[PDB]
Amino acid sequence: TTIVALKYPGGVVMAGDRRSTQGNMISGRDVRKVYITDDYTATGIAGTAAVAVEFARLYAVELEHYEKLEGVPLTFAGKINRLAIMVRGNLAAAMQGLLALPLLAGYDIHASDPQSAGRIVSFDAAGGWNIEEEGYQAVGSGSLFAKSSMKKLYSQVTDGDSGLRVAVEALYDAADDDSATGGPDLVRGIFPTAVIIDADGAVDVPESRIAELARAIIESRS
């Protein structure tokens, strides 16, 4: 499992792989680990797949419940606080093996400069949260390789397409160095999922663009 998130001028992009394993045995080849929680937020959870799905569903329900009750969506700080509280509440179960690491990407509509409204938030094992200012973050078993690839490739990010390509390349590197991360499958045609958030909202990237990017990267490294 590996989920990367990175800012580009005017928005944020967030991508995730598709493999889920039980030990060394591959059990799922098309798992979706990036979820669009609200119109301007996307969360991705690494670790146990069941806990990831549970947290995603519960967090989306919580945000929608607050919005329906009060007639106004939470500020980004409120969403961060709710996610951090949910992470803190699972610490006892995480000690029992039901561990889940979330990574949150968003677009702050109330920010002053719209070009710098993208926000990346990372949570640690104790429930604390940190708003990353380096422009990229990653979670999962292959997070270190992905982050070290983004450190070198982040100078090339200029727009949404470049950010998506850099995210796909980072996921490819993580899969290259880690066995629990699934790389682009050219045989079955299964590719990493991605979500792009900008001023118009959050949209799922169609699989065609990701497929072309992955094929270009693969031919580049051959």
Partner: protein, 215 residues
């Protein structure tokens, strides 16, 4: 005797509902349209219950606001327990009817409110919009065309009956609803729609310049 006390309680609830602003909910081609006379900008009588389920009320604000919160809490829990598509407007109307009946029978003062739960079809699906009206005592009725709430409802009901046309457009439906409600201006009006063309969440408010231009 219980009969005299119950009649006085019903009269109290009816008098409370009567001295209140009127609400109209009518089905049109795109879904359901809620039009209420609301001078206030912050206190709102029309809200979303769930993806395709909307709520309208007439009466004392705190009471139907409490009912709205309870219905939202029920709908969210039901959606999380089984699935989003397993929540229907019929279940919410039934819960509201049971709650209002219990409140009327057991509470010290009955709720002087009248509710309407509206439901539209899902995306890419055809189904006639459903409107349910719940009174103070818990009686539940299915209105196929339009619901009128609060105040003297007879003139607005007759005006709608004469002027209503099935499968009308949004502008035509708003004109009919406003004309029946007059028997108002852009301000002191709250207009909302359950739009069956939305992908997931059908509720949408029509306020400001869009309301001014459309009306």
């Amino acid at each position: 005797s219980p009969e005299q006390a119950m009649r006085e309680r019903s009269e109290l609830a009816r008098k409370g509902i009567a001295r209140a602003k009127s609400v109209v909910a009518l089905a049109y081609a795109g879904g359901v349209l809620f039009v209420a006379e609301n001078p206030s900008r912050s206190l709102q009588k029309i809200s979303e219950l769930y993806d395709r389920v909307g709520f309208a009320a007439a009466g004392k604000f705190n009471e139907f606001d409490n009912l709205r919160r309870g219905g939202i809490q029920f709908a969210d829990t039901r959606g999380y327990a089984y699935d989003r598509r397993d929540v229907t407007g019929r279940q919410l109307a039934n819960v509201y009817a049971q709650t209002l009946g219990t409140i009327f029978t057991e509470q010290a003062k009955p709720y002087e409110v009248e509710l309407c739960v509206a439901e539209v079809a899902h995306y890419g699906e055809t189904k006639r919009p459903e409107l349910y009206r719940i009174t103070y005592d818990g009686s539940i009725a299915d209105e196929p065309h339009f619901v009128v709430m609060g105040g003297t409802t007879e003139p607005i009901a007759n005006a709608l009956k004469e002027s209503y046309a099935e499968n009308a457009s949004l502008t035509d439906a708003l004109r009919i609803a406003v004309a029946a409600l007059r028997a108002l201006g852009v301000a002191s009006l709250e207009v909302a729609v359950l739009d069956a063309n939305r992908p997931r969440r059908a509720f949408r408010r029509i306020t400001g310049s869009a309301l001014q231009a459309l009306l």
